Design a protein around this ligand. Sequence first.
Ligand SMILES: OCc1cccc(Cl)c1Cl
Length: 408
Amino acid sequence: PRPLRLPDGPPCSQRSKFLLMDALKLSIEDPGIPLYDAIKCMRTFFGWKEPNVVKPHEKGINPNYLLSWKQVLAELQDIENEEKIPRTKNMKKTSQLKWALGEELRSLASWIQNEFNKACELTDSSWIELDEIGEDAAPIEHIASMRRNYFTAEVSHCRATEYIMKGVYINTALLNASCAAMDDFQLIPMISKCRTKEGRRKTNLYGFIIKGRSHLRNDTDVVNFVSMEFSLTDPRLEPHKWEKYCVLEVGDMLLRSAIGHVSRPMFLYVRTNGTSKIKMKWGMEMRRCLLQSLQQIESMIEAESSVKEKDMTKEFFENKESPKGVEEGSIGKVCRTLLAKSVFNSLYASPQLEGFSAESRKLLLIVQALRDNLEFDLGGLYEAIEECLINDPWVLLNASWFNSFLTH
Ligand SMILES: OCc1cccc(Cl)c1Cl
């Protein structure tokens, strides 16, 4: 039993629907209309400057990406002058937008492991309410509630939880617009809401998307969109990550940092993309990632409870023939690690991931049984696994992880 052969080639590139570790938020402290919130977030920033391309899209029409962003600013400037901010803004159907809206092996790069690491971290803000998890009709039993409270306290601030609510919000807004403005190039703010450690509600703007025409007769029909996302990441440090994007420099931002106050350039990551009804419906269900990882944690708690003939919830979560430690260093880190895996499975869903998960599972049980009991042939299963290792960053990372497991 050898390691999986990972593919040779240029490094894999980002393919998520929105930025993850590289996102940047413009934020207001709240006292519910997306466009109004977006404009108020825009107003908090004074470092805008004339935009230019700093990392061109190698296959796209870069002037059109630039034109599209300048059109967003100009049309928000229009809204500023009208007396009442409208509920929604439909973009002029300009040549640049008509183009942008449509009217090979890759090797493992280090950035996806870094994304996963960032997804497991805690943030300074809470992204869910105390009763966010579950959809029970009846009141829950005392133990079930205890497990939920413990788990929630461990993941409410997790970056992966921000990715969930960000994903829920933008898929809801796009699925709604695809239906409520079928023929419009509607401008759609990318928003999230969170609560600071001190209890203050804040509203965040990540950027914008503009949807194309969306006559979605069935679940697989595709609506195209153009995404425009703030970032402080200079794309020239890892240009292979940004193969699908045109990247603009659009401002300069004053920051507090470990070296004192600094001025940093602000970037806008622009790409054309698409999604479908069925993917948007799954996007709206990403809170189930919280439920799934809770259930893995509970699994787990039961195993310990069955052996000790006593419920082990408190002992498990408070870390009080029994386990002497936690490999990740804390129970919190186990919860956030399981959540991040579930969230990345959703952010990077693919058929290659489905086959890899099902096929690598069979090889794992086989290798375990062999390791356990030693001091019909595997070639067919290895080809089944390795046929999924093409170019997808998340699948390749999981293959790399799988190979460490084979080694030890
Ligand atoms: O307030 C939104 C907006 C529209 C047009 C130009 C600029 Cl610089 C801004 Cl902040």
